[PDB]
Design an enzyme around this catalytic site. Structure first.
Site, short mmCIF file in Angstrom:
data_model
loop_
_atom_site.label_atom_id
_atom_site.label_comp_id
_atom_site.label_asym_id
_atom_site.label_seq_id
_atom_site.Cartn_x
_atom_site.Cartn_y
_atom_site.Cartn_z
N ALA A 81 -25.96 -19.78 1.36
CA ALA A 81 -26.39 -18.65 0.56
C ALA A 81 -26.66 -19.07 -0.89
O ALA A 81 -25.94 -19.89 -1.44
CB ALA A 81 -25.34 -17.58 0.61
N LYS A 82 -27.70 -18.48 -1.50
CA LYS A 82 -28.07 -18.60 -2.90
C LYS A 82 -27.06 -17.82 -3.73
O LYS A 82 -26.61 -16.75 -3.31
CB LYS A 82 -29.47 -18.02 -3.08
CG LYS A 82 -30.10 -18.19 -4.47
CD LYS A 82 -31.49 -17.45 -4.60
CE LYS A 82 -32.56 -17.74 -3.53
NZ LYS A 82 -33.71 -18.62 -3.93
N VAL A 83 -26.68 -18.36 -4.90
CA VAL A 83 -25.86 -17.64 -5.88
C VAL A 83 -26.68 -17.39 -7.12
O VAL A 83 -27.25 -18.33 -7.67
CB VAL A 83 -24.51 -18.34 -6.18
CG1 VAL A 83 -23.66 -17.49 -7.14
CG2 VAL A 83 -23.74 -18.64 -4.88
N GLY A 101 -23.56 -21.17 -2.22
CA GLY A 101 -22.29 -20.90 -1.58
C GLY A 101 -22.51 -20.71 -0.11
O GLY A 101 -23.12 -19.71 0.26
N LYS A 152 -23.67 -13.77 -4.51
CA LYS A 152 -24.00 -14.59 -3.32
C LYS A 152 -24.92 -13.75 -2.45
O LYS A 152 -24.53 -12.65 -2.07
CB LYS A 152 -22.68 -14.94 -2.58
CG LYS A 152 -22.76 -16.04 -1.55
CD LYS A 152 -21.35 -16.50 -1.12
CE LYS A 152 -21.32 -16.92 0.33
NZ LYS A 152 -20.31 -17.97 0.61
N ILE A 191 -28.02 -19.80 -9.98
CA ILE A 191 -27.08 -20.72 -10.62
C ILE A 191 -26.48 -21.70 -9.62
O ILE A 191 -25.84 -22.67 -10.01
CB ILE A 191 -26.01 -19.96 -11.46
CG1 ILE A 191 -25.23 -18.94 -10.57
CG2 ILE A 191 -26.70 -19.27 -12.66
CD1 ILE A 191 -23.86 -18.52 -11.06
N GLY A 192 -26.70 -21.48 -8.34
CA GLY A 192 -26.08 -22.35 -7.35
C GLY A 192 -26.16 -21.93 -5.91
O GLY A 192 -27.13 -21.31 -5.45
N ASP A 228 -10.39 -26.03 4.40
CA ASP A 228 -11.53 -26.73 3.80
C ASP A 228 -11.33 -27.09 2.33
O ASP A 228 -12.28 -27.00 1.55
CB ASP A 228 -12.85 -25.94 4.02
CG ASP A 228 -14.12 -26.76 3.84
OD1 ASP A 228 -14.03 -28.01 3.91
OD2 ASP A 228 -15.19 -26.16 3.59
O1 LIG Z 1 -15.67 -17.50 -2.36
C1 LIG Z 1 -17.08 -17.45 -2.23
C2 LIG Z 1 -17.77 -17.92 -3.44
C3 LIG Z 1 -18.33 -18.30 -4.42
C4 LIG Z 1 -19.01 -18.76 -5.60
C5 LIG Z 1 -19.97 -19.76 -5.52
C6 LIG Z 1 -20.63 -20.21 -6.65
C7 LIG Z 1 -20.33 -19.65 -7.92
C8 LIG Z 1 -20.95 -20.09 -9.12
C9 LIG Z 1 -20.60 -19.48 -10.31
N1 LIG Z 1 -19.69 -18.51 -10.40
C10 LIG Z 1 -19.06 -18.10 -9.28
C11 LIG Z 1 -19.35 -18.63 -8.01
C12 LIG Z 1 -18.69 -18.21 -6.85
#
Ligand SMILES: OCC#Cc1ccc2ccncc2c1
Ligand SMILES: OCC#Cc1ccc2ccncc2c1
Lengths: 313, 321
Positions: A23-25, A20, A40, A17-18, A129
């Protein structure tokens, strides 16, 4: 894969989905609760101190506007962070889809940013940040602060004294930049080189667009003070006239999400899953190890908070 | 902004993923209306991974194939590199493997013939991918594989410059190679994980994984057909000179089973033979004449031509607003 054996005891993995911090989420389902989570995935062979600073801040921070850490798993070649699912996207996406937001719309959103940062600061941290990419909307279109890799960033969001190298006042400047980008749709300081961006930030001169209300302009001058001794304090930001205009009460920053008080309904459901008595279960929960137990407790608490039964399996 | 030139051409949508160590966003190409993946590289953040970005871009400039995720457009600003790429909504081959038990032999062949097609094309162009793994294969909206992540690709006979479980013996030691034999090893690792659900060489440490790869000894599960076993022994040869060639992989009996024709690896996506419904709609909209597009600069023109060609291939009208 041996890298996914312990993970897949607890979580049903879904799609990417994304992103972070490189890192891949991935979307996942926590099996015991049925609750949806963000996972993550770090490869520890391919910014290791950044990962550890984040994890250690997220272990000590717990708040309604900070994206919740549930579970840390570590294997041979991986670190998994199980986090609060935010399907609503980034605040960045939201800004760029409209041109900007109306004053009324950015008050709604900005009071949530203030809440989270005021809480971070009360815990002895500065996020260092703050940017729109680092705020995500949950299922209830409420903001959740992410990326705790710098602690106690983007050059356009960095305070003058931060670029000089001369800690929580710099976050206020960064919320000022945020306040502007929300109501304008562009940054107050922007250039094609880093040196021209830096010099713009040092001068502290920015365009005030026509659509900005005088109230907006006043708050922007108080937050976008180049002198951090002249910057608006967290105390006066909380009950600022701009902040309270349509809500005649100050920002509630204090966490509604405890480390100490334990929900009895969740402890009794955890006790029936574990086959044990309380005080063994409470003492276990109160250790907060960020293992399968804290994940299940906090997700049972989140299940209960959405009205659904405080039940497991 | 950093986003001024991008937003002339693309309507940006939400974050959908990651490419290498960079954000991927859904977007819409304004002119063609076609959906697009945009990989966003921050220039003064990634630093040590800038040569990896440039190796990918330069490979993707020279590779155009039905099973390679297509590069449309490179934009470079003050602090950013945008790669506009072919949208693959079907997820990763990884996701497919982890969602079910092992694949049947027949399910594996469907998928594996597409991997062979793409890699045989890469190798015919004088490249080796060097990072073949199920995370680097994505399904498009018709469930066809697209090879991604060319950051570690090399020209083994050219000028000089992955996952340890997918890495060839000679690659872990660093030999004097024609470099493409290492990709055959990786496809064999892929073939096994698809039919088994686990890796042929796997350990809790990197040093014990390396030693397992050097020995070359692996379990043959009971459910594996003799045909599968034969192909695995040919691909999972520790000596890269004893490994099956791309030539013999293409018409291998296991490969040929049920299809009865060899893998068609040659590209159906040309650099030369322009389909001129696109040229004529590119002539009307952009007010100039049909003496070309053929410069292939990976600018807005390349994007629009290739996406118009895609929009025609979808059945939708060859139209530029
Ligand atoms: O605090 C570290 C983190 C994170 C993060 C990144 C992408 C997301 C996408 C969807 N839901 C939660 C998520 C949390
Ligand atoms: O080979 C470079 C690439 C790529 C890439 C990465 C992630 C994607 C997600 C969705 N659609 C296409 C994608 C392409």
């Amino acid at each position: 894969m041996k890298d996914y054996d312990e993970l897949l005891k607890y979580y049903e993995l879904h799609e990417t989905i994304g992103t972070g911090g490189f890192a891949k989420v991935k979307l996942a389902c926590h099996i015991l609760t049925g609750e949806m989570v963000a996972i993550k995935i770090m490869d520890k062979n391919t910014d290791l101190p950044r990962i550890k600073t984040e994890i250690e801040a997220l272990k000590n921070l717990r708040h309604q506007h900070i994206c919740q850490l549930y579970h840390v798993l570590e294997t041979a070649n991986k670190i998994f962070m199980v986090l609060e699912y935010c399907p609503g996207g980034e605040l960045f996406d939201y800004i760029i889809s409209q041109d900007r937001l109306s004053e009324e719309e950015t008050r709604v959103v900005f009071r949530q940013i203030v809440s989270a940062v005021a809480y971070v600061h009360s815990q002895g941290y500065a996020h260092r940040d703050l940017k729109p990419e680092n705020l995500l909307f949950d299922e209830y279109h409420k903001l959740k602060l992410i990326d705790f890799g710098l602690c106690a960033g983007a050059l356009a969001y960095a305070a003058p004294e931060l670029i000089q190298g001369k800690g929580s006042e710099a976050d206020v400047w960064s919320m000022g930049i945020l306040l502007y980008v929300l109501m304008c749709g562009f940054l107050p300081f922007d250039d094609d080189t880093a040196a021209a961006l830096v010099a713009k930030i040092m001068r502290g001169k920015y365009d005030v667009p026509k659509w900005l209300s005088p109230s907006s302009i006043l708050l922007l001058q108080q937050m976008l003070q180049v002198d951090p001794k002249k910057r608006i304090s967290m105390k006066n930001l909380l009950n600022h006239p701009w902040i309270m205009q349509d809500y005649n009460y100050p920002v509630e920053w204090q966490s509604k999400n405890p480390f100490i008080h334990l929900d009895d309904d969740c402890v009794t459901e955890l006790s029936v899953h574990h086959r044990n008595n309380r005080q063994t279960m409470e003492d276990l929960i109160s250790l907060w190890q960020y293992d399968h137990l804290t994940a299940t407790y906090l997700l049972l608490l989140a299940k209960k908070a959405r009205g659904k039964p405080v039940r497991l399996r």
